Amino acid sequence: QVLVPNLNPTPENLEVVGDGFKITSSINLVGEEEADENAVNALREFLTANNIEINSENDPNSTTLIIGEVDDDIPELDEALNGTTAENLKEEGYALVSNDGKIAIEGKDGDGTFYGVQTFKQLVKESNIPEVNITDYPTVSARGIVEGFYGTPWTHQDRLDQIKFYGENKLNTYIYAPKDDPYHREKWREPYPESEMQRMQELINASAENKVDFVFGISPGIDIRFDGDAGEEDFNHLITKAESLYDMGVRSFAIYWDDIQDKSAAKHAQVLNRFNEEFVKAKGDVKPLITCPTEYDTGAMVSNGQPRAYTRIFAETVDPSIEVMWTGPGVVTNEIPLSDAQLISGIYDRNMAVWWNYPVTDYFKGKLALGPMHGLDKGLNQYVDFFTVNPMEHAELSKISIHTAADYSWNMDNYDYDKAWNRAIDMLYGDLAEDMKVFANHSTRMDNKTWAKSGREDAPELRAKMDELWNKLSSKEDASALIEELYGEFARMEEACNNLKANLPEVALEECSRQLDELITLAQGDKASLDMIVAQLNEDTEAYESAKEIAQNKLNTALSSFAVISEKVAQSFIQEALSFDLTLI
Amino acid sequence: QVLVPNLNPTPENLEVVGDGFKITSSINLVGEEEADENAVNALREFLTANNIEINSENDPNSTTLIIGEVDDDIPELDEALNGTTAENLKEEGYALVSNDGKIAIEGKDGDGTFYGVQTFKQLVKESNIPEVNITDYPTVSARGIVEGFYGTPWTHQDRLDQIKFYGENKLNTYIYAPKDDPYHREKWREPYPESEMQRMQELINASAENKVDFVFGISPGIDIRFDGDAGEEDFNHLITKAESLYDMGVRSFAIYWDDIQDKSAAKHAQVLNRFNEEFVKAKGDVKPLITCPTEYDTGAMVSNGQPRAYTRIFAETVDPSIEVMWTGPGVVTNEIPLSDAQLISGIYDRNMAVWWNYPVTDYFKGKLALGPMHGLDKGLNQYVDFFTVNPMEHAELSKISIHTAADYSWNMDNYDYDKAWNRAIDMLYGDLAEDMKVFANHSTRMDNKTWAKSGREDAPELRAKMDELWNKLSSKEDASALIEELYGEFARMEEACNNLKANLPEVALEECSRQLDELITLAQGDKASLDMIVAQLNEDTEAYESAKEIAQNKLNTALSSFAVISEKVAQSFIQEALSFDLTLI
Ligand SMILES: O=C(CCS)N[C@H]1c2nc(CCc3ccccc3)cn2[C@H](CO)[C@@H](O)[C@@H]1O
Ligand SMILES: O=C(CCS)N[C@H]1c2nc(CCc3ccccc3)cn2[C@H](CO)[C@@H](O)[C@@H]1O
């Protein structure tokens, strides 16, 4: 009475200074005319949605809401704040104060005020708001998503929903770069058909409405020509393509050189340099150029602590103001330790950009990647200024992990993966969060068994209970309490998935139904594996064989089926149980 | 210009002193009346079998062979030896010199002469013998096999052949202790039927002829009673059972306490101490008593560098004379480092006996264990004086592993596991050795997925090549030459197994035919995996789908089979290749 709701991202400084209060049926609004337009529209939108009416003329005992920027002439704003302010904060910073009848939102800039509104929306539950002092700002200057995967691109409606979602969670960057949009890569020289041009316009419009930088990516590297008139003809295709998007309102651009056979470092860098001179600077209001080199992970860039030839030449040729992305120690890796960022930053003598390949699943499509940002150093901001994730072709389920990315990039120093994971599912799933937690917990780790691995381990608590079972059984100690307990877990998995099948909204259900079925199967095979152990302990041959065929048939279903989940946990347990000989005397 | 053939075990000191010579069709035998009877019978058997006649009257043109102990009075021996003796060597040591038509075998004791004859037998190839100076003796004084596994016990013929094989490889210990002989454990109180006693007499006799200590094990722990009249009766049952075996010539005995629920250390030890006194000492010619405690691996014996309650009590109570067995840091474990032996040896303050659970496969019967002794500290002899291995229910194929155990325990310091394994297969398989190497190289590592793991990794060099293929393909580099090399390895795996199916003697083929077909299946799936990769590289979609279906069926077949082989190499490669998504374009 009254408690601070789940917030995402976690604000830098939040203090509870009171007991909280109810916001009236209709309110007074001060500052609308000079405040940021986007911020105001997000406020209006929320206020309409929560049945809250705006007064035509001040009343004295309605709740008052004041909104604006530090540069603005609003005396009531300086008053309602009472001490704390956004003057001392970096771009996108804001102060928010809630004190008996008065909510004050002040941004350092228009972005700031918009962000303050988002926090305000998350603060209000039931018309009740807690009494708080807040100053808030991002750790990392550029935070967001690169739609950069292989497979079916996000639908136009998907992206519009993603862009809204980025705004709500203070993500400011969306990179358009679908490997399978023909006009982005395969037919990069060719202009967009009129109908896609108009859909693009809506995206840029929606991006501006949400303080998101729409970055238009192009990948010419498969066949771009570099020398002579063909080099001239090709460079002019790049400029043409860029201009047609610039004319629609695009102010951020990327040229990418990943996943190509050509390794002409000097020529790649020189294309970038010419585009930087003839397009970026010449336009004057365009953000820094973004790129990634053909060598983009530490394994590929560095040999024996020294940069390899391509990287060396690229690093020394590419202009200082161009943003360079890299993926970490590997393309899909467990971790980015600080020493890796330090290494790559020093090779490039600039703050680096990260293209994090998680939750992307294009390389192992059967598994859903449903875990938090995991493995990333909490001091990465020392060498990184731009942090993006590559998501799954499954736009709705990608939100869980994107939600944690939003918390990690905004408030890096206090990021707790486990807490951000739980908060993400809570905020996204409502009355279904506990069940969605059970399911998603078994689907966080990605491993193609060769070059690609990343994510928190699947269901670690349950894994540790399984190990303890084998430990007890092999030590020939009583294990019946732990066995009773594992029945509980396997029955819980199955119930959770069934409830999820019955109650998930279609938008989520269409992306995960097969994996839900997989987990039910594995749970059933897990339970039967228990029956099988109990039978051996009881020396009941009949009951053993009968549980064994069930367990083996469940395992066979799970292995033959497209969906993949819980490989090292629920699936491995069946394998472990079938390989454990308790028939020894 | 000989050369020295393969020898097992590796002699302590061997030196080539010349070019070698051919032994004549007929020879002069000196010392046959005075030297060890068992050594002479072994010698006569070898001569008979290699068409070498013995002169009844001396002939200066014939090769001269001289045999005896240091304690024997023989002038020719001393003369033929010329500087080298067994005088200052330990028990079981011998000297051997072959030089200028002379071969001199001198043992330190009768056991060493026998082993001298054994080295002679390995030295002669087609009447040719290298000219050598040898002094030789074991690192460890008790070396052998404990038949102590669960499963079908070895047949009577099995055991007779093993005992001969132990003789030839200088193994001096055989512990009879099969878990599923009802009279060993299940009905340990009940006497052996007379026909089984006759079978025992032949075992005892064969052991004596081969300098092997036949050790009679009994395991009363499931239900022995300790207190009052009940315990007295059960103690006399142990005496009776041992007496009946002593009466046939058994002079070593073991009483085991493993794999039972009753953890009464003081009682177990009291039983042992009583048996040590009223039986072993009462008899004067019985070797030290052998046991294992209910806590017999370091995880079960120790907590924070200190003994657990059972172990502490057992160690304080059990007589210093008694040999105590332990299995290392776990029951089935990768290694015994020196620090483990030192720890256990300190607790019991005595040199320890080792029960090594490799090549035993009772806990994972589908896999054959065909690797060398691996993981055992080369300095173990400082705290261990007794080394035995627990073999597979498969007697014949156990020989590969046992062969390397003979070399490790006899010549510990110079033991090379790769060399010994290679030598074992060369010596045992003859013309089939190169093919058997290909197959057995895939079947060395034991792993039940949970508590039990031990042995050399399966096909290491092939594993590293597969690793390098994935490292090239995921870096989009040219991998043609390496692909080609892999096609060759896989074809070779198939060729070897097919040649083994057609030409292996039945006694070995009976034990591995399922594992032969399984490796052929995986080899074919491996090939198909390569096909699938090359199709993906060439964008040939239909050849890919065709290869995919084959790779997948071959894996499914192997996974379904009782037979297990090459989990982490040949089998894993298919899973790796199916998960490697190269259709992303
Ligand atoms: O990671 C990058 C650029 C990093 S700044 N590019 C893409 C990329 N390249 C790789 C490794 C090389 C490879 C590509 C396709 C098939 C096999 C290996 C992985 N990935 C990502 C995950 O599959 C894929 O989504 C990306 O589009
Ligand atoms: O190891 C010993 C005494 C070592 S001085 N005893 C035997 C033994 N006990 C265990 C662990 C307890 C266990 C037994 C059956 C099923 C599951 C666990 C393993 N093993 C060996 C490997 O299977 C088995 O061959 C042995 O007969």
Author numbering:
A (entry chain A), B (entry chain B): 40 to 624
Text lifted from the article:
Posttranslational modification of metazoan nucleocytoplasmic proteins with N-acetylglucosamine (O-GlcNAc) is essential, dynamic, and inducible and can compete with protein phosphorylation in signal transduction. The O-GlcNAc modification is removed by a single enzyme termed O-GlcNAcase (OGA) (Gao et al., 2001). Inhibitors of O-GlcNAcase, the enzyme removing O-GlcNAc, are useful tools for studying the role of O-GlcNAc in a range of cellular processes. Previously reported compounds showed undesirable inhibition of the human lysosomal hexosaminidases, and there has been no direct evidence of the cell penetration of these compounds. This work reports derivatives of the GlcNAcstatin scaffold, showing potent inhibition of human O-GlcNAcase with up to 900,000-fold weaker inhibition of the lysosomal hexosaminidases.
The β-hexosaminidases have a narrower (difference of approximately 1.4 Å) and shallower (difference of approximately 5.0 Å) pocket than the OGA enzymes. Interestingly, a cysteine residue is located at the bottom of the hOGA active site (Cys215). In an attempt to generate a potent, selective hOGA “suicide” inhibitor, the N-acyl group of GlcNAcstatin D was extended and modified to contain thiol-reactive groups that could irreversibly react with the cysteine located in a pocket at the bottom of the active site. GlcNAcstatin F carries a 3-mercaptopropanamide side chain and GlcNAcstatin G a penta-2,4-dienamide derivative, both potentially able to react with the hOGA Cys215. The extension of the N-propionyl side chain of GlcNAcstatin D with an additional thiol group (GlcNAcstatin F) increases selectivity for hOGA to 1000-fold, showing that the elongated N-acyl substitution abolishes the binding of the compound to hHexA/B. The molecular basis of the increased selectivity of the new GlcNAcstatin derivatives was investigated by X-ray crystallography using the CpOGA V331C mutant that perfectly mimics the hOGA active site (Dorfmueller et al., 2009). The CpOGA-V331C GlcNAcstatin F complex (2.5 Å resolution) reveals that the inhibitor-binding mode is similar to the previously reported GlcNAcstatin C/D complexes (Dorfmueller et al., 2006, 2009). The 3-mercaptopropanamide moiety points straight into the pocket of the active site, whereas all hydrogen bonds seen in the GlcNAcstatin C/D complexes are conserved. Interestingly, the sulfhydryl group of GlcNAcstatin F approaches the active site cysteine (Cys215 in hOGA, equivalent to Cys331 in the V331C-CpOGA mutant) to within 3.5 Å, although the side chain thiol points away from the inhibitor, and no disulfide bond is formed, in agreement with the absence of time-dependent inhibition.
